[PDB]
Amino acid sequence: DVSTSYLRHNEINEYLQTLSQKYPSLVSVEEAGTSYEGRSIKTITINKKPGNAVVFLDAGIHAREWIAPATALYAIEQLVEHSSENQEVLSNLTWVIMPVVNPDGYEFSHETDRFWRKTRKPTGKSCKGTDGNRNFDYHWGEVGASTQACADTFRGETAFSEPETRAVRDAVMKLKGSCKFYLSLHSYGNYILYPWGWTSKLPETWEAIDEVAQAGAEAIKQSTGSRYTVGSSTNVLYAAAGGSDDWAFAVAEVPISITMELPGGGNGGFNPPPSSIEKIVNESWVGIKAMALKVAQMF
Amino acid sequence: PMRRSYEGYKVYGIVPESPDEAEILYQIRQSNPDLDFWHLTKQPGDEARVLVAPKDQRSFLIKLIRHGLHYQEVISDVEG
Ligand SMILES: [Zn+2]
């Protein structure tokens, strides 16, 4: 079970490598890029078949949001190690999952500072790190992103200044029009949100995304009774430019683009105790599977 | 071998009672990078959470007092 403890980055990549060896007909593991400090940013591709719609799922762009990589890892475990229980999202759907976008920051939050958020790439003489979810090149730097190098929402020296966000960009762009569902896992707050992050004006196809997002919230409510708030980002969060969901929607042209804020726990919300991981990732997968199924029915 | 010390740090919970009160929290976050906002939304009844270093605690609370916001000290000592 990957849902009993928070895994370090090397354990995550070792788990992926094991899956690539154990399931060579179902799974391929590849390097999408290399972090600033030299760590391998890997994806796992599940059920690759010509003509399939692709779900791209990433997590761990923000270092301290530990329940998101755990949820991504649990999703991988269900789809790969329990595929017979998940055929409804494995017929015409291919999954590409990036369980940790920001391994340098993630490891730093384990070793030194539990509440670290950014990358670790130096930004000048005084501080290190960029907010990866303010670093994507769509209306970059226009609102809700700090210009201060040491702020936790620092937008970066330029758009896509971080190899970690370039890795997300390259991995998504490699799908060459086949990606129909982009899903980014964060914490915390129990929200299922969609573009625009940077403005309150609704996108023209917001209803299609809302249909998917409501399906995830509904499935979660029917499974555990937990409530999720669904809507366009600015309904819940103050406007911010440079998020990955905005970029996937507008630049990668992914019709369904969603950011999920996973349940909080522990004294900080970001740090549910390890004993609570299983129930959170189990419930989260219920919503994620239901959104993918809706996408599978639409494409 | 060595990790960041959180000695003397506190976490405060704030529940804004209007969109204007929540906006005050947003300006505080945007203008004071030394504060660590763990959570901040526009959701009614939601609790914002802010981790505050000892050097910032008196000034931060006075800003809360100045604007009439309700707050609670939810963690008194993060303890290193
Ligand atoms: Zn986040």
Residue numbers in the entry:
A (entry chain C): 7 to 305
B (entry chain A): -1 to 78
Published text:
In mosquitoes, the A/B subfamily of MCPs (including carboxypeptidases A and B; CPB and CPA, respectively) is primarily responsible for dietary blood digestion for the release of amino acid–rich nutrients required for egg development. In the midgut of Ae. aegypti mosquito, procarboxypeptidase B1 (CPB1 or PCPBAe1) takes on a different role in pathogen infection, interacting with the DENV-2 envelope (E) protein/virion and impeding viral packaging, maturation, and release from the midgut. Based on sequence analyses, PCPBAe1 is expressed as a preproprotein, with a signal peptide (Met*–Ala*), an N-terminal pro-region (Ala1A–Asp75A; “A” to indicate the activation unit or pro-region), and a C-terminal mature peptidase domain (Asp7–Phe305) (CPBAe1). Here, we report the crystal structure of Aedes aegypti procarboxypeptidase B1 (PCPBAe1), characterized its substrate specificity and mechanism of binding to and inhibiting Dengue virus (DENV).
Here, we characterized the enzymatic activity of the mature peptidase domain (CPBAe1) and determined the structure of the full-length (FL)-PCPBAe1 (proenzyme) at 2.08-Å resolution. However, the structure consists of two molecules in the asymmetric unit of the crystal. The activation loop (Asp75A–Asp7) that connects the pro-region to the mature peptidase domain is disordered and could not be modeled in our structure. The pro-region adopts an open-sandwich antiparallel-α/antiparallel-β-fold, consisting of two α-helices and four β-strands. The mature peptidase domain contains a zinc-coordinated active site triad and the substrate-binding pocket and displays a core of eight twisted β-sheets surrounded by eight α-helices. One zinc atom is present in each molecule of the structure and forms pentahedral coordination with the catalytic residues: His68Nδ1, His192Nδ1, Glu71Oε1, and Oε1 atoms and a water molecule. CPBAe1 contains one disulfide bond (Cys133–Cys156), which is the only conserved disulfide bond present in MCPs. Moreover, CPBAe1 displays two of the three cis-peptide bonds (Ser193–Tyr194 and Pro201–Trp202) present in mammalian MCPs. The globular N-terminal pro-region occupies the wide active site cleft of the mature peptidase domain, mediated via interactions with residues from the substrate-binding pocket of the peptidase region. Residues Asp34A and Phe35A from the pro-region make contacts with the S2 subsite residue Arg70; this interaction is crucial for blocking small-peptide substrates from contacting the zinc atom, and thus maintain PCPBAe1 in its inactive form.
